[PDB]
Amino acid sequence: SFETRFEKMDNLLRDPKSEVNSDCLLDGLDALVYDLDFPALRKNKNIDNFLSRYKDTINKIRDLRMKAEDYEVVKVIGRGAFGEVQLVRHKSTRKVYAMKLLSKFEMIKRSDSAFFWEERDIMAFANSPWVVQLFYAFQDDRYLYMVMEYMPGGDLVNLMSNYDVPEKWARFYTAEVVLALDAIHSMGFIHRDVKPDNMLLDKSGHLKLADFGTCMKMNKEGMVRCDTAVGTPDYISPEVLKSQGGDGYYGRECDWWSVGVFLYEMLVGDTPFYADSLVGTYSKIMNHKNSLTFPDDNDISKEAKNLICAFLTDREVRLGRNGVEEIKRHLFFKNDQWAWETLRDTVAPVVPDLSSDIDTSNFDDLEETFPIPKAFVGNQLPFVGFTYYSNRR
Amino acid sequence: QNVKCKIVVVGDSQCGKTALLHVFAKDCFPENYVPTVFENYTASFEIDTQRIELSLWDTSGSPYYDNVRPLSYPDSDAVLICFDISRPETLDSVLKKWKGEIQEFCPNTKMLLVGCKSDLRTDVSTLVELSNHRQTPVSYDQGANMAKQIGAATYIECSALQSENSVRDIFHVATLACVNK
Numbered sequence: 001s002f003e004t005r006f007e008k009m010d011n012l013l014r015d016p017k018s019e020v021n022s023d024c025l026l027d028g029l030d031a032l033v034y035d036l037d038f039p040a041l042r043k044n045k046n047i048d049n050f051l052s053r054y055k056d057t058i059n060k061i062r063d064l065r066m067k068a069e070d071y072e073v074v075k076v077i078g079r080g081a082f083g084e085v086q087l088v089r090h091k092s093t094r095k096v097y098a099m100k101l102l103s104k105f106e107m108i109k110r111s112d113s114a115f116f117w118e119e120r121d122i123m124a125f126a127n128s129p130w131v132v133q134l135f136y137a138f139q140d141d142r143y144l145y146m147v148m149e150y151m152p153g154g155d156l157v158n159l160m161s162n163y164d165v166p167e168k169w170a171r172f173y174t175a176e177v178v179l180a181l182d183a184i185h186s187m188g189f190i191h192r193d194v195k196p197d198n199m200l201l202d203k204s205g206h207l208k209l210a211d212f213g214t215c216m217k218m219n220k221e222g223m224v225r226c227d228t229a230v231g232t233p234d235y236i237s238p239e240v241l242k243s244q245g246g247d248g249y250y251g252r253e254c255d256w257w258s259v260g261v262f263l264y265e266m267l268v269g270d271t272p273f274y275a276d277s278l279v280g281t282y283s284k285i286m287n288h289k290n291s292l293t294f295p296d297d298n299d300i301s302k303e304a305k306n307l308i309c310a311f312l313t314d315r316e317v318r319l320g321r322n323g324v325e326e327i328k329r330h331l332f333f334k335n336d337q338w339a340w341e342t343l344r345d346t347v348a349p350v351v352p353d354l355s356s357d358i359d360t361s362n363f364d365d366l367e368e369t370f371p372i373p374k375a376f377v378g379n380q381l382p383f384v385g386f387t388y389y390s391n392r393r
Numbered sequence: 394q395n396v397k398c399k400i401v402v403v404g405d406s407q408c409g410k411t412a413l414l415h416v417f418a419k420d421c422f423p424e425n426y427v428p429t430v431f432e433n434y435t436a437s438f439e440i441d442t443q444r445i446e447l448s449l450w451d452t453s454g455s456p457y458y459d460n461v462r463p464l465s466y467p468d469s470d471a472v473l474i475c476f477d478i479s480r481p482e483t484l485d486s487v488l489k490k491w492k493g494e495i496q497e498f499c500p501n502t503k504m505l506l507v508g509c510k511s512d513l514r515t516d517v518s519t520l521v522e523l524s525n526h527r528q529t530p531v532s533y534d535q536g537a538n539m540a541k542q543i544g545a546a547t548y549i550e551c552s553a554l555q556s557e558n559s560v561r562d563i564f565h566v567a568t569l570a571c572v573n574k
């Protein structure tokens with residue numbers, strides 16, 4: 001009728017999962033008045049005697065919406081693709097989050113103006129203890145921002161280089177991944193970039209994942225169509241690889257393979273398909289039935305070398321092909337130390353040694369721009385709807 | 394104009410060079426062996442969304458032609474040195490002759506060891522025959538432990554005959570040797 005109009009409507013400006021919750025319409029305008037504030041463009045009286053209309057409020061506003069310098073920063077604990085990731089303390093709230101920055105200019109040059117929207121959903125909406133909580137997501141003119149709960153444990157690589165991982169342990173860190181993946185599968189998706197660089201540790205010693213650029217909601221029947229290669233090249237699936245230029249079409253067995261390559265980097269110290277060359281590490285993978293090989297070690301328990309070889313294999317054969325369940329059942333997770341629903345409940349294998357609200361001991365240490373629009377570019381564009389706060393009870 | 398890389402193939406006679414360039418660039422395995430000489434297959438590949446254009450060069454392995462084969466090296470982007478997995482004779486040859494003749498005409502060009510006819514490694518016939526000479530087919534390790542001793546970028550195998558993909562998986566690996574540069 002009519003009430004259920006101005007009704008079904010209002011609960012669509014609050015709905016965060018919406019394309020238009022207030023915070024998004026904002027994000028809209030803000031990002032437009034950025035793309036018309038040019039002398040070039042105002043030779044036209046539409047732009048000029050409109051941007052005039054909204055000067056004295058478009059200013060009054062960028063002043064409020066969680067602006068970037070609301071945060072002062074501690075250490076920078078990660079550079080990467082597009083810009084860095086810093087450990088920040090909120091100048092007001094005194095709370096410590098871990099801010100991800102995205103270089104806007106360099107993100108439209110590398111022609112990836114949207115690979116993150118799934119990382120927004122996942123991080124902020126899959127309420128999970130396997131997922132790194134996304135607390136606020138705000139933008140300005142030059143960059144993007146994602147304020148994430150901070151993980152003082154470090155990546156898994158900081159670990160494998162500072163300890164010589166035992167099987168007792170590779171049983172743990174592995175099955176805590178297996179869980180955090182069947183998480184992200186039955187949240188609808190598929191990860192694809194599955195490496196120790198992307199596994200962090202909460203102050204409790206247990207594990208969470210971050211970086212979800214690569215992700216992608218599976219179609220109706222469980223697969224995906226994609227003709228581009230993705231993820232670090234040591235851990236890359238053979239299906240995800242030979243897709244690079246070809247009718248690539250894969251399920252979620254491609255996260256599974258990545259896991260075997262990890263159960264290996266842990267128990268042997270180097271990766272299973274290493275090679276000098278970007279192209280040399282790809283040829284080891286291709287010839288996997290022939291190139292995979294363990295050193296002069298038979299201390300590698302029979303049933304561990306035996307799991308690695310069930311993941312590292314053709315996709316139609318690969319363990320997990322017929323259920324995330326036949327994985328939990330491997331003779332390799334036998335132990336008087338637990339069963340599964342209690343895993344992140346138990347006590348870590350290695351527990352982080354921290355001194356203060358922000359000890360980055362487990363971490364190591366570390367202005368281009370735009371062209372003034374002739375006509376109307378539309379740069380600040382598919383960066384809209386990206387804002388999201390918390391408040392929601 | 395789309396990116397265009399040039400690719401040359403050398404190797405002992407009958408190792409299966411023309412078996413494979415014909416499978417990849419013409420989608421059918423050759424019915425009758427004929428000692429190729431020069432021949433210019435014209436293929437096309439795809440890395441990540443975009444087209445590379447491929448110009449392939451088949452050659453002779455016969456010493457009779459040691460004098461002419463080197464007219465194809467000039468300005469290559471990537472060369473494929475070959476050996477027949479069912480004859481260790483032809484690998485002690487990717488060392489005697491081919492490392493040297495490639496090192497010297499296309500020196501500033503990625504080279505790349507490829508073992509052909511891999512499907513014969515499990516044929517009771519070409520074993521029963523290789524033992525009647527105190528020989529025994531080339532094992533993957535015998536293969537790479539050669540390639541990394543002659544300076545190849547990677548070693549890779551393929552049954553030019555059995556599964557079509559084993560060959561695509563080759564021109565995939567080597568498109569990348571051209572373009573990655």
Ligand SMILES: Nc1nc2c(ncn2[C@@H]2O[C@H](COP(=O)(O)OP(=O)(O)OP(=O)(O)O)[C@@H](O)[C@H]2O)c(=O)[nH]1
Pocket residue numbers: 404405406407408409410411412413423425426427428429430452453454455509510511512513551552553554555
């Ligand atoms: N099983 C198997 N047989 C092959 C394969 N490749 C070639 N052959 C056989 O071996 C013969 C040699 O193949 P070719 O490639 O045409 O000969 P070539 O290597 O070009 O030798 P050249 O005279 O120097 O050009 C062919 O008649 C095929 O019957 C292969 O990959 N697997």
Ligand SMILES: Nc1ncnc2c1ncn2[C@@H]1O[C@H](COP(=O)(O)OP(=O)(O)NP(=O)(O)O)[C@@H](O)[C@H]1O
Pocket residue numbers: 077078079080081082085098100132148149150151152154155197198200210211213
């Ligand atoms: N929520 C977090 N808490 C603590 N450290 C983090 C967090 N998120 C990212 N890091 C660190 O930043 C590194 C890489 O993070 P990421 O944002 O994924 O960079 P990247 O651009 O994805 N690198 P690439 O694989 O080439 O795309 C990790 O190895 C961590 O050390």
Ligand SMILES: [Mg+2]
Pocket residue numbers: 080197198211
């Ligand atoms: Mg990373």
Ligand SMILES: [Mg+2]
Pocket residue numbers: 410411412427428429
């Ligand atoms: Mg021939």
